[PDB]
């Protein structure tokens, strides 16, 4: 089925890293760009990163130099690694997609969303 599946953020420990796998099904991977969306509770939508189906990538301005994010056109899956956790992670994340031409495009696929909560 045409769906983007991403695993939710689980509990962890300080000094560790969080791995999230986003997989596209029901359509060819090299057909739509991969986009990150963030939504805090009682807040609108914020976007972090861009991964092209085949090419470079655009990181997060705020979350730079500490987030591992790449692409792999073998299993149609991407992996995001987060380190140096903080209380700002408490939100819902959408690993969504857009059109094949960017800019003026339709956001046909949507993700279920991962609920990330960090607290002490």
């Amino acid at each position: 089925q045409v769906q983007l599946v991403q695993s939710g953020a689980e509990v962890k420990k300080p000094g560790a890293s969080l791995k999230v796998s986003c997989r596209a099904s029901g359509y060819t991977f090299t057909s739509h760009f991969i986009h990150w969306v963030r939504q805090a509770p009682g807040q609108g939508l914020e976007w972090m990163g861009i991964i092209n189906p085949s090419g470079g990538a655009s990181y997060a301005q705020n979350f730079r130099d500490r987030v591992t994010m790449t692409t792999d056109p073998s299993t149609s899956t991407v992996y995001m690694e987060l380190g140096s956790l903080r209380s700002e992670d408490t939100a819902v994340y959408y690993c969504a997609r857009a059109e094949g031409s960017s800019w003026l495009g339709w956001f046909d696929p949507w993700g279920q969303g991962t609920l990330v909560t960090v607290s002490s």
Partner: peptide, 9 residues
């Protein structure tokens, strides 16, 4: 930006 600039570079 809309003509020469590209997301892929």
């Amino acid at each position: 930006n809309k003509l020469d600039s590209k997301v892929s570079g």
